[PDB]
Subunit: 343 residues, 4 copies
């Protein structure tokens, strides 16, 4: 028997939000980094992590030139960054929505270990998620982010880790879709270890199949969701070398065997790649000569802002040049999500 | 760990066979009817069911005019029909392959009831399927057919029936793909009962999701398979009336939320519809203004041959006119799988 | 491959804690009622719900006569009650452990609705559960409590609700067993509605089977857990009448088909029954002439304290008589968990 | 909603048949060996495998002295052996039932490989099983036998093999229970390889949990079934040595965590052990100081008849001495299923 989780108006608003995020030429900037991660990236450059420095760095990221307006369609923020204001007086949700962006927020509470496994973790953050998502909906956020961590090892990912992470992702996506917030499913598989394209493609296909079975079990409206996978790439310790079009063929092949075409867009990770190989691999994915019935774009945290952070240097007068760095990468990734990129 | 079920040459031959079946403009004639079904269709017209009458009727079907050559890309046969010869001396596999067709065979052994359920059945025919599929591969058959039966009722389809039928379908498809035979997955849901488009779409989405999860569990090569679903239509006893484009929107919507685009083609059932509404609904499906990344065509048993059977009359001299009837329907359904059909 | 979730010392301490709780003749008093529930039970008698009244009522419950020492082996508390002191100066964990009791705590965060279902809910409280369980372990609590809610209806409990509640229960039990806290699995099925013994027994068997499959999937040590089911009883609106030994036969039959004998004890609910029928039904369960390879005892919230609450009257001088009421019920339920009870 | 698979009379007759098989002191002789297996055991002694030699060997087994009457409660036969007569004129079902035995039959069709796995097989024999079971029910057979094969390896048993074998076992048991035939579930795990007690116990617990979840999914009446597991023993190539009571503790521990007490009896395999260690291990299992709420007995094919076969020598005049050999082993195993055995 059919009891609708969503009225057609809810399905309509979720569909147009998800269509506004992955619009052609546009992608996602991931500024969702919590205090420890931004703290260690500020200690790598040599700046002590305080609240004004974080506000100023995300000010540098968000108040850039308007050439990134048909580049960035969505911005993922932290919980703290929603309630921080720019020096002009506008809050950062208004600063994003002023130039055509969509406000997002990271809503998970980290990873927690699974007992009985070999270093496998599940993820946290389901309690009070309805009230938090309603509050973030009043604060201007239209989509969310939630990250699962899986690793390829000697007998990992096991059935327990894949089943539990898919179940928690589907529960999260149901809670977000009840409040009018587009969920972005991120089943990230770690590039650590020594494994070829074959085992990464196998693991990615099994993980994505279990994720979409869990989404069908939990009555998720697939047109109002986004997918945030990795690119199918070999491990860091793997000695075999692969062309970019081989990685692109493996990625589009693993996506076409699992992902139903009702899903609106696919935004890839950077995932420890360097800043140029992300645009190279995304460009090679968008010229793969297969039929790809969804939006292929980027959701790059580090590969959008690494050069801007390093050319910032922690002092204010470098700002514009730092911003200028970011601008190139944004436009580059825009061409990388249109197949027109050439290094 | 990855152990390949198929070498790349096996994947290649399965891919080109499945591409040759659902080639643009082409569809499937289903002459797979067993002795009881063809017996009752011969008693409806008033002909006693004997071996010569069945051979002559399938002779009338298969030796038609050559205008059906870019209409029929595949023919499903019975086990008996593979070893029957035409009056010219050619066997029916040669009679099909002479004009560009691909030979198929129905390989299941019927339905068997599931205990503890309310009139729910599973399907039969897994024992010795490897030797039978190897034998049919030597006899010229390149694809197979297997039919599951599900009904919408007060609490049906239950979880047991959907899980069991998806498991048996995936086991069948693995056994067929080991022998170089393209499996055609047919999860038919019965149009009996009083239910709207909403419940049929819900049931179709749940069934197709469980089927494709079972196919991912059994390491099925999805590019070398075909899907044989129904059109999402209301029940026979349902009093509400629906447009053809509403049925088409419901069907393409239920397909886009479940079926991954690696599947080569989708061949619909007739499913108790009359002979013209099958072409009307298939035409309306092919003009649905959504993105459909697979071949949408027909696999019509009764809706290709009902008028040819009734204009045959059981006597030989009507033959050509009977054949002529079939020819129109074939060409009509060809336009129905290209969106160019107009009644 | 086997990675142990628990060392043998952890398995040993969990086993002896769970053996100390369901020791022969002993049962569990459930004082775990949160502020709204104790508030409405205090408004039914006519006392305004404040902190001193709750502390005094749980003082009346916990500081009773020492005849309940071989009656109560465990006490479930609220989070607030662990940090409340008696008038003598002892904290309530010390007040429980002084006379042979084991301290427990309710650790869930309530119920949250499941979208797409018909009034089905899952349960909450997984975030930060490791730190909270470590903190409660330092505060003297040796076991936990977590309650799932399922209802029998027209098509409920569905597969989604049973699967999700079993998964959350197994995740909770893994997190509790990592910290040395015995989890008590409570898959309560609501007695609301009109349904016989047959459908309640069917639903109880399906729910318990899915729960124990989820416990086997999550590597739960079954000797260091407890089960908190209901008695298999008809609905409130069901017109058919049943003997007590019929209810007992249905309950022991539904338990014997699902629960493996490694589970240490089974502590039943009261579940909206009146105060005498709980002891009658528990007594009838313990004289069922089947082989019952576990401890059958009680975990009664309302059926231990309803008469003590009503004879308390909200004024202090009734205290001892109120306590005296509780004492009878405790001793009665002790005989009810030994089969020696006679009204 | 509840639709009963079995009426209470069917449940009653299945319960008394299963109680008559595993009655205290009684066990099962497994003469179910097909033509290749009995052929290679006849070529090991040096007798050419013909129909008269097989009939005479099973005549030697079945027409033994009447001291095995409170030893053997059931005999598993081949399909051929049901229709063979003794020299006295009685058919072998009558020869078994004359002295208190229950006639069984092996009803599977062997093993078939699973594609995509590493040497993992499923089992065959589901087609026409209802008609075959009805026919065997008219021929005097009251129970059945069906054998699944699982092996411990580098990543085996996988999830696919365990899920598929449990599903096929539950389907078989439903079909057998519909016809009034007690199914004996045999999830045999192979002792090949190098693995300790720990990994064999882990694999046995996972396999038995998935088997009983599949039995609960298929509405199997657990009181009218029997379980045929292995003893938890190390591999053949494992260098570590274990006491018999360690093997017994591991076996009873793996059984108590999975098997619900509604199952009537547990009949162990020999499984490549020598003829005395089977009685030693079964005796040690029956003195394990845990609570075992079911019948623990034997189902020994080779460990009942190896000495009788070798002392037979293929010539008739040794017969009685050969029979005498068998008699000792039967009585020994009877004491081994009562804990009173002493070598």
């Amino acid at each position: 028997h059919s009891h609708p989780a969503l009225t057609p108006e809810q399905k309509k608003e979720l569909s147009d939000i998800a269509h506004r995020i992955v619009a052609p030429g546009k992608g996602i900037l991931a500024a969702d980094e919590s205090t420890g991660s931004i703290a260690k990236r500020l200690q790598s450059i040599g700046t002590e992590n305080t609240e004004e420095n974080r506000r100023f760095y995300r000010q540098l990221l968000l108040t850039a030139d308007d050439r990134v307006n048909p580049c960035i369609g969505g911005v993922i923020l932290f919980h703290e960054t929603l309630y921080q204001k720019a020096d002009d007086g506008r809050p950062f949700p208004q600063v994003i929505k002023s130039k055509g962006g969509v406000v997002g927020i990271k809503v998970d509470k980290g990873v927690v270990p699974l007992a009985g496994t070999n270093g496998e973790t599940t993820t946290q953050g389901l309690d009070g998620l309805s009230e938090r998502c309603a509050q973030y909906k009043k604060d201007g956020a239209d989509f969310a982010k939630w990250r699962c961590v899986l690793k390829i090892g000697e007998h990992t990912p096991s059935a327990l880790a894949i089943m539990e992470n898919a179940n928690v992702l589907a529960r999260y996506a149901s809670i977000c879709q009840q409040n009018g917030i587009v969920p972005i499913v991120e089943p990230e598989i770690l590039p650590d270890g020594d494994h070829d394209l074959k085992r990464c493609q196998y693991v990615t296909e099994k993980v994505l199949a279990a994720v979409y079975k869990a989404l069908s079990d939990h009555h998720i409206y697939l047109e109002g969701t986004l997918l945030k996978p990795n690119m199918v790439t070999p491990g860091h310790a793997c000695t075999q070398k692969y062309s970019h079009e081989e990685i692109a063929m493996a990625t589009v092949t693993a996506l076409r065997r699992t992902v139903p075409p009702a899903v609106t867009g696919v935004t890839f990770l950077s995932g420890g790649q360097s800043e140029e190989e992300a645009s190279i691999n995304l460009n090679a994915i968008n010229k793969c000569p297969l039929l790809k019935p969804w939006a292929l774009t980027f959701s790059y945290g580090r590969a959008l802002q690494a050069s801007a952070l390093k050319a910032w240097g922690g002092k204010k007068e470098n700002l514009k040049a730092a911003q200028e760095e970011y601008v190139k990468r944004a436009l580059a990734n825009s061409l990388a999500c249109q197949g027109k990129y050439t290094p």
